[model samples]
Target: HDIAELKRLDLAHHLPAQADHKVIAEQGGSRIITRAEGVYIHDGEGHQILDGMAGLWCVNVGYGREELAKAAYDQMLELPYYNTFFKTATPPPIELAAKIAQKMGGHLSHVFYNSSGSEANDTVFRLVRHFWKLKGEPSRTVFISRWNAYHGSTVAGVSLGGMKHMHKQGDLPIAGVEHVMQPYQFGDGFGEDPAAFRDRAVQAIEDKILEVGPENVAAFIGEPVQGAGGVIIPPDGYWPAVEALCRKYGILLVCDEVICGFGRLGQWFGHQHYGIKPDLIAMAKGLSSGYLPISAVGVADHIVAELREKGGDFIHGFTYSGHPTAAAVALKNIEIMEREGLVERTRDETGPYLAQALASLNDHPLVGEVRSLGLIGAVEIVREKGTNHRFLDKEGEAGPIVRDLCIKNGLMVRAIRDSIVCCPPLIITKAQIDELVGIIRKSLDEAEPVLRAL
Candidate 1:
């Protein structure tokens, strides 16, 4: 489409996710992303911008892999669509499930499919309740999460998450959900000892479980890295302690791997990176490298056995659950990642290089901290040089300014609260990392004076 037609059609038909459509119309319509290749997207106006967030933390294998496209085309030609509900199963889903299990290993051996992280989480809600019900604990329906976490936009996903703003919008957290403090050292435990802060956050879970009565709690769910919540990587002791607490109470542990799975964290799954086992794992985004919509949940063998022995009917699934074309693309995406050593690259090559490159920004006046693991990272913006101080009378003031500057200068990263967070494609090179770091540094330099006045 030409610029005029693109603008017209966008205003007439497109209702974008997570945006004010009226404001979008008033401000000249959205940037028309015409195509993407190898971690960079080209706009219709012919501008090329680096995709720092990896298409919302997916696209693990980068973009424009012909193998993934061919896989989808062939699957569509052979078996386009099939329902997994009619006492039949498609080969793509069955084979894909086996591949996921092979990578995950341990009790996480059974896989269930959905079209998005939201739906995958919804399945988790139902499946957890059903698992408890089979064990005669029908009252175990509560799921505990953390504040500022992003699960998805769907109702169940929103509720299972603890983002208060989203909850306010939908009158959400419908019922049987509780929230605990996130292990956010920069925001919540600033100036505190890391080990002590970790303990406090972990304790919040057990405290909530005790408050709500463990008998009523079914599971605890959390993103391993707290992706949308400023990439809040917990201190080393947090997850293991949380895992122990969950085991102490017999509550099933659910890890939302939607952002951290499929090599975003250099490990096939983020929980493995931390050395903890979750009973259920919700994954999406990178599952198909964002080529097609596909999400999945890895279930422990015991849960499957219980369902098989006691369930007359599983009763919950989407119309496009286990979509063959999506599964095929996802399989090929994983194959490419393996063949190219994307995960290993992320761990040993690009990830560390990016971190080292980003560390140079620590000297910037606005940078309070810079932290990263694998390809995902955050640069905390602060009012003071040494402390994690926010702008007086205005929270989240600096990060957004620098974020806009970075975008204007040709880099795409997210400003979550006061943190400039990024998750580049796994295939990003050392040169690209250096370029990205330079842009961000330049952005901070440009934004510093403007932010100081504000």
Candidate 2:
């Protein structure tokens, strides 16, 4: 079918995730992405845009990997379907779980599969409560998380996350979730001394713990670097302090590695990079490089011990808990990452190059700060280069303008409040980094005059 006809069909039949239906209808339709290869995606109108966000920060291995497709195909042929229920399991997930455990390499020795990041986090929510209950401390129920963190979109996931807008729809953050300040130095602690800011950020958790009563708290959950929250990297020493607080209170520490796992942060997982040990980890996205829908929860040995010793049927799982095909793809995805040394390359090579490329934008008039960890990065769009001031009276104004220009200029990035965030594929080259940075520069230039007029 022609592009126009396809878009008409889309408007009539499709409802996209996290979009305004009326606005999509007012515009002709959403951009119809036709296909992609490597880091470039081609749309219906034939515009080949560099995927700066790596298809929502997944796709770390990039697009069109023949082996990934083959892995899925072979698994489908070999064992098309099976449920991990009824005291049965499939070989793919069994091997994949063992492999992931090996990669994690610590007390985190078990994996429970889910279909999405939301489901993974939901498992974390349930598992944490159950672990406490089985240990005869059922009163330990509250979960503390930072503001603007992205966990997932399920009821439990939304409750675990700190996005207020998401809470609005669901009457969420459900019963026992507590919210705290994030370690966002640029936006929340602007111009403050870095060490002071770090202490303040960490203290928020301790404060919340004391207020809530340490005996009542079950866990403290956070992303290693809050990805959807404008790539807000915490100040140095922040994680260690958070870890210490959790330990002091006997609270479980959970890392939502849905976006930070699989070498996105130059390590196999973000907690590894930050040097903090989490009791539980919720992971998805890069597990299969977006080729298949699969997620998992990594359980620490101590938590598993409680379940094994003081056990009942644990009583939670999904029908597609360990979908064979998805597991196979995930296994192959890790193999590919290991074989190609994508994680090491990110740490030692492209990661540094990307830092330099992003640093080139710091001198730009509109760029307030440019920051990155491995392939994930952000450029702050501000009215004053050294300050955290935005172009209009409030936040969210200049970001959209500049973000629109970036898309029009053939780069796909996200504008979170007043920052242009990006997470290119781990396979991205230095040349590609230069290209991505240049496009950002051009978009900022194009947006400046419009922003000034406003």
Candidate 3:
């Protein structure tokens, strides 16, 4: 197809996800990315840009894994489509369930597959509420999450998420859901010591639980590191303290690993990095390296046993629940991660290297701070150091400008308000990490003058 025709069709028909439709139309349609290989994506106009965000924080094995392609192909030929309802289950999904269970340990043994993280979260919504009801405590239905944490885009996902912009769209949060301050030391507790902020953030959980009446709370859900919330890394003490609070209140501890799962954080899941033991885990994205849309909720042994003894059918599932093709690809994706030692590689090699490279930018006048764990990283752009200063009006003006500059200089990244954030493929080599750092530094150098003009 001609580039012009592709743009024309996109304008006339393609309603993209998270885009300004009219703005896209006016700009002659979005850039048509034609192909990808390794860490590079080639567009219609023949630009080979480095994918620094890992295709919206998935693509763990990087692009063009023919092994994954063959897995999907073989499964489709054998069992293309089938519903997991009617007491029927397929081969791939059955195997996939056991694989995830093994990773999560003997407890967290049950798995419920869905097409996306949003659906996985919806399953969590029902499972937690039902678990409380089965325990003869029906009032324990409210779920607590931190402000700025993103779960998904679904009704339950949006409601359970604490993003105010999303909540305003649907007048949501549905009921039985609440939020608390995030463990954002940089933005929320700028002048304080890290340990002090960590304690305060942990205490806020207890504060919210008290206000809501712990008896009415069923769970506290959070991303191990708030990804879409600008890669907000909590202090070392935060997760353990929150875990203790949940245990004290008899509320479930839920870890949303939609982004932090599958070795993105050098651990199998982000919660593992913090030594957290959660009753429920919402997982997706890296599950299949985004080779296919697949997500699952990891249910603890007690939750599974209670539901089984209670003996009622879970009346919730999508038509594509436990989809066989997606399951097969996911199985192969995990095999690749294991066979190649991607997780160990991230832990010992690339993860630490990336952190050191990011740290090199700390003294730049335009950079207020830089932080990372594993491949997930952030560059905080500010007007000056020792202060959480933004450029005059709102958010942070330098972020989007630096992000655009990065892309133009051949590295794709994202701007979450004031933070220039990235989660590169686990397969990224040390050289690529250096290349990314070089590009970020150069972009900042170029953007600083332009931003100063504004």
Candidate 4:
């Protein structure tokens, strides 16, 4: 197909995800990504851009894995589609669940599958409520999440998430869901002591739990590092404190690991990095490295026990639940990560190297701070060098300018409000890390003058 014709057709009929149609029309059309290899994606116009955001924070094993392709192909040929309902099951998802359970350790031994992170979260919403009712605590219906967190884009996922812009769209947050302050030291507690900020942040959750009456609260959910909310790595001791609070209140603890799972944070899951245990974990993204859409919720042994003892059928699932082809690809994806030692490499090598490389950007004129955990990183763009103030006295003003420059310079990243964030694949080499840092610095250099004009 001619690239220009494709663009024309896109403008005429296609509506992309999470996009403004008017802006899409104004820009003519979106850039068409044609092919990807390793960590680079080639566009229709022949630009080979390094994938810094890992294809929306997925694509963990990198791209072009023939093993994954073969796994999907063979599985489709053998058992293309089979629903895991009415007491029927397939082989791939059954095997995939055990592998996931092994990674989750002994406590979280049950896995529920879905086709996307949003559906995984929806499963979580329904499952949590059902679990509570089965445990004879029907009043425990509320879930608490942090402000600015990202779960998914579905109605329940959006309601559970605290992004105000999303809430206004559907008049959402339905009810029985509460949000607390995020553990964002730079933005929310600027110039404050780290320990004090951590305490304040954790206290906010406790404060909300009390206000809502702990007896009525079902659980507290959070991303290990608030990924879409600008990679807000919490201060030390925060996660453990949150865990303790949930235990104290007898409310379930949930980890939204869609972005932080599968070596993105140098651990099998982000919660492991902080040494906290959660009763339920929502995982996707790296489960299959985005080779195919798959997500699952790991249920703790105790929760499953309650369900078996006092509950009947879940009565809540998708048609594509435990999809066999997706499961096969995910199985192969995990095999690649393990055989290549991607998780260990990220922990012992690339993660620390990325932090060191990004440290050089902290002194740049447009950079206020830089932070990373494993492969995921962020560079904060500010009007001043030492503060978190934004350009033009408005939030989210300068990051996009730097981001556009980065892409033009052949590195694809994302601008989450005022943070220029990157989450390169775990297969990223030390040299590629240097290239990513170099591109970011060059982009900031180009953006400085333009931002100063504002």
Best by lDDT: 2
Worst 10 residues of 1 by lDDT: 390-399
Per-residue lDDT tens digits of candidate 4, residues 219-290? 999999999999999999999999999999999999999999999999999999999889999999999999
Model 2 weakest 10-residue run by lDDT: 384-393
Error of 2 at 114 (Å): 0.2
TM-score of each: 0.99, 0.99, 0.99, 0.99
* Cα lDDT tens digits for candidate 3, 275-339: 98999999999999999999999999999888789898778888888899999999999999999
lDDT of 4 at 258: 95
Candidate 3 displacement at residue 57 in angstroms: 0.2
Q: Model-by-model lDDT, in order? A: 0.90, 0.93, 0.91, 0.92
Please give the TM-score that candidate 4 achieves against the real structure.
0.99
**Candidate 4 backbone clash number:** 0
Tell me the tens digit of each residue's lDDT in model 2 across 1-454.
3889988998999998999999999989888899999999999989999999999899999999999999999999999789988999999999999999998877899999999999999999999999999989999999999889989999988888889999888888789999999899998899899999999999989999999999999999999999988898999999999999899999999999999999998999999999999999999999999999999999999999998898789899999999999999999999999999999999999999999999999998999999999999999988986788888758999999999999999999999998999999999999999999999999999988998898
Q: Lowest lDDT 10-mer window, candidate 4?
A: 309-318
lDDT of 4: 0.92
C-alpha positional error of residue 50 in candidate 2 after TM-score superposition, expressed in Å? 0.3
Ranking by lDDT: 2, 4, 3, 1
